[PDB]
From Swiss-Prot, chain B:
Cellular component GO terms, alphabetical: cytoplasm; cytosol; intracellular membrane-bounded organelle; nucleoplasm
Name of the molecule in the record: Hematopoietic prostaglandin D synthase
Required cofactor(s): glutathione
Keyword Ribosomal protein: no
Role, per record: Bifunctional enzyme which catalyzes both the conversion of PGH2 to PGD2, a prostaglandin involved in smooth muscle contraction/relaxation and a potent inhibitor of platelet aggregation, and the conjugation of glutathione with a wide range of aryl halides and organic isothiocyanates. Also exhibits low glutathione-peroxidase activity towards cumene hydroperoxide.
Keyword Magnesium: yes
Any Gene Ontology biological process: prostaglandin metabolic process
Subunit organization: Homodimer.
Domain GST C-terminal: 80-198
Gene that encodes it: HPGDS
Gene3D superfamilies xrefs: 1.20.1050.10, Glutaredoxin
Major place of residence: cytoplasm
Binding note for cofactor: Glutathione is required for the prostaglandin D synthase activity.
Induction: By 12-O-tetradecanoylphorbol-13-acetate (TPA).
Length: 197, 198
């Protein structure tokens, strides 16, 4: 077991997928949460100047999904075949693309853009996901993968700004319930610092 | 496998897939659609986006998910599991930046404004970071070319159209482009491919 140190803000955000993975695999790690106020001099120290980063035995990794993928390699979270891994990867990038469209670090242009994405794109993404899932218990294959984790994670944040997101998609709510019922995840959820984002 | 790649008639987000097919000498249908046909095809797609790759009657989407799938167990994948993490990380950093550009913006003044801000204010910092990350090494990750090297060349070719002086202070990054373009399979694809601006 190597020594892990995750660095991010005190929020779920882009680090949370890494945090679910560690919790599910029961891998001990240091969950380092920096203060908004300290982000300047921290940022200048990093190779690509962004967080989260994951230090592994003195080697600094970056890019939340590159890290997530690395940590789930050779686990039951990866998806069984090379094809399934493609589906896991595609679903995760689809969710990530959409979340990336929101101007998180913007103030009056921010509200317009949020509503554009939540009123136009969101229902379309929801319908596409529901169709893609259709009937299966999990998003890829017959067991849980880190794509299901990411669905639960991204949808939790989207529901903050659009509470009715899933009112007409009970099958996508069922997937959220299934992720939250995993004892390791339920346990993390109750223990993690409560944040809006 | 019978492969059919569907995208616009441009390099764009499909080009990484095209480079991989060329390097591995794999046959595929390079299906290029017009804008006028786009409404009719869009409703058929899994998430309404292109590129998609059809494989023996099954549809894959997401260019980098597909790129990664195609390079699994080939020499374009990282040599180790951690190198594969470095490859993904570099690819996503490139894609992130490229994704900030409003490529589909129908208001040309807004588009041009956002393009100018990203190219003069943001691009130089990313070019510095990539150059520092490369250092004196031959390839971005490990001892040999990976699809991250392909994606650097693909993305920088497009960025150089709009900012020709992008790599003026980064000769080692320009040498990396030249090495990728010199790989025979890539060299011939650059000659074969339809000549488009983007
Ligand atoms: C679950 C998830 C997934 C995301 C995927 C792509 C992009 C952003 C994502 C986010 C996300 C990321 C960041 C924020 C977010 O609130 N960012 C602002 C950064 N703050 C730093 C401290 O000082 C104030 C500004 C909100 C949401 N969350
Ligand atoms: C190499 C590369 C990489 C990219 C990575 C992320 C996002 C966009 C990328 C692009 C890219 C993608 C799209 C465009 C682009 O020109 N998009 C416009 C889309 N259509 C408008 C209607 O007519 C048909 C074209 C330009 C560049 N290229
Ligand atoms: N795709 C990257 C994005 C990294 C990113 O842009 N993170 C934000 C925090 S949510 C950041 O560091 N932005 C602040 C800055 O650039 O200073 C990832 O998933 O890790
Ligand atoms: N991250 C995705 C992006 C897919 C995407 O947004 N592609 C664009 C074309 S470059 C698209 O389908 N947009 C047209 C539309 O939304 O109608 C990928 O790499 O495949
Ligand atoms: Mg991405």
């Amino acid at each position: 077991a190597p020594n892990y140190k995750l660095t991010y803000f005190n929020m779920r955000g882009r680090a949370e997928i890494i945090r679910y993975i560690f919790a599910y695999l029961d891998i001990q790690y240091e969950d380092h949460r920096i203060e908004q106020a300290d982000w300047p001099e921290i940022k200048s120290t990093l190779p690509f100047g962004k967080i989260p980063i994951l230090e592994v035995d003195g080697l600094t990794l970056h890019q939340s999904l590159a890290i997530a993928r690395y940590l789930t390699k050779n686990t039951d979270l990866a998806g069984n075949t090379e094809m399934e891994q493609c589906h896991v990867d595609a679903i995760v990038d689809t969710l990530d693309d959409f979340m990336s469209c929101f101007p998180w670090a913007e103030q009056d242009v921010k509200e317009q853009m949020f509503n554009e994405l939540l009123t136009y794109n969101a229902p379309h993404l929801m319908q596409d996901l529901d169709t893609y899932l259709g009937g299966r218990e999990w998003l890829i294959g017959n067991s849980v993968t880190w794509a299901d984790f990411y669905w639960e994670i991204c949808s939790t944040t989207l529901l903050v700004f659009k509470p009715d997101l899933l009112d007409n998609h009970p099958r996508l709510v069922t997937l959220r319930k299934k992720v939250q019922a995993i004892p390791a995840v339920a346990n993390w959820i109750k223990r993690r610092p409560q944040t809006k984002l």
